[PDB]
Amino acid sequence: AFERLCRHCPKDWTFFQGNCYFMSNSQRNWHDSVTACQEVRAQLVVIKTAEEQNFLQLQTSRSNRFSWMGLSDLNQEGTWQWVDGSPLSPSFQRYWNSGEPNNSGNEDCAEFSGSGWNDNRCDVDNYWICKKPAACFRD
Ligand SMILES: [Ca+2]
């Protein structure tokens, strides 16, 4: 019975597989999107599974919106790393759109666009997506 009581999300957030997702109503740059999610006790979305990627990408592909995710190459090595410190894994490289990542022109931040991901300049104003765990409590 406990699973059924562990699906609580804030209003205007979407539940998927144990987490809650917020799609913003306005646009900010990448770093300000990181901070926006922190302010609501969440994180600019870090994708952990293919199923999660498919869920998120489907919301994007319908919308024609560009949305920041919690992924950048902002480190000494210049490697793609999620904001929780985890590296971008080999099996997720299939999610970049054709032509991406450019890995040039300081396109250091990742965004959802269409059926996949782009790298883009971090000063661009995009929508953003936050993720936080769903809450467990009685009803
Ligand atoms: Ca790019």
Domains parsed from the chain with CATH numbers? 1-139 (3.10.100.10)
Cα-based distances in Å from 35 to 43, 56, 74, 92, 104: 8, 20, 16, 25, 25
**How many CB atoms are closer than 10 A to CB 104?**
7
Q: How remote is the CA of residue 106 from the centroid of ligand 1, in Å? A: 9
- H/E run at residue 59: helix 50-63
C-alpha–C-alpha distance, residues 28 and 71, integer Å = 15
- Is 103 annotated in a binding site? The answer is no
For residues 59-71, one letter each, b for 16 or more C-beta atoms within 10 angstroms of the residue's C-beta and e for the rest, the string is: bbeeeebbbbbbb
**Closest residue by Cα to residue 48 from 133, 136, 113, 137:** 133
Q: How remote is the CA of residue 87 from the centroid of ligand 1, in Å? A: 19
Q: How remote is the CA of residue 16 from the centroid of ligand 1, in Å? A: 28
Q: How remote is the CA of residue 88 from the centroid of ligand 1, in Å? A: 16
CA 116 to chain centre: 12
What is the resolution of the experimental data for this entry, in Å? 1.4
Beta pairing partners, 118: 111
